[PDB]
Structure formats: C-alpha cells, structure tokens
Amino acid sequence: EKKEKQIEQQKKIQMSNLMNQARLKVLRARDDLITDLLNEAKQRLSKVVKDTTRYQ
Amino acid sequence: QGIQQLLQAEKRAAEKVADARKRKARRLKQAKEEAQMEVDQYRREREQEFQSKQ
C-alpha cells in the first residue's frame, strides 16, 4: 500500500503535467498565428509608406 | 522391596514430564520458523505485484 498508492499517484501527476503541457503547447501555438499576423501587417504598412499619394 | 522401586518408577513419570516440556519445546521452535516461512508468501506477493507496477 506504499508500493501501489505512489505509482497511481505518480501516474496522476504524470497525467496532470502532460495534460497541462498539452494545453500550454496549443496556446503557445496560438500566439505564432497572431504574432506573424501583426508581423505581416507590419510589412504592409511599409507598402503604404511607398505610394506617396496614399501616404501623404 | 516396595519403597525403593516406587521412587525409580516415579522417575519414569518424572521422565515423561521432560517429554511434556519437549513437545512444547520443539513444537514451539519448529513452527516459529514456519511462521517465518510465510515471508515467502510475501516474497511472491511483492514480485507478482512488481508486474502490476510494471
């Protein structure tokens, strides 16, 4: 009962940390779709800088 | 004569009290280690539940 109770508890901690990093990987993979979107928008402001009749 | 044979035959009864201690000497001692032979019933319990750990 110290051999079976720890290996089910360490199974639960291993299942908890794996479920948490399953959430923290998909949430960090939500940033790179947003951060490049702000980066791709930051590219296209510089094209507005180019054409002077829109830039002025 | 009757009085001297009574004492040596009493020593026969006084030799069967030495068996009345012996059959609670050996039997106390032999199955005390048979109670320690149930450690092997624990040694199979750990190694078969080593598999459920595995």
Give me the total of CB pairs closer than 8 Å, taking one residue from chain A and one from chain B.
7
Determination technique used: cryo-EM
Provide the resolution (angstroms): 3.8
Kindly state the tokens that stand for B41. Answer: 């019933």
Residue A23: exposure state from Cβ atoms within 10 A (0-12, 13-18, ≥19): exposed
Answer whether B51 touches A (CB < 8 Å): no
Helix A4-50 with B39-53: angle, nearest 10 deg: 20
3-state secondary structure of A50: helix
Kindly state the tokens that stand for B54. Answer: 């595995």
Q: List, in sequence order, every beta strand (DSSP E) within chain A.
A: none
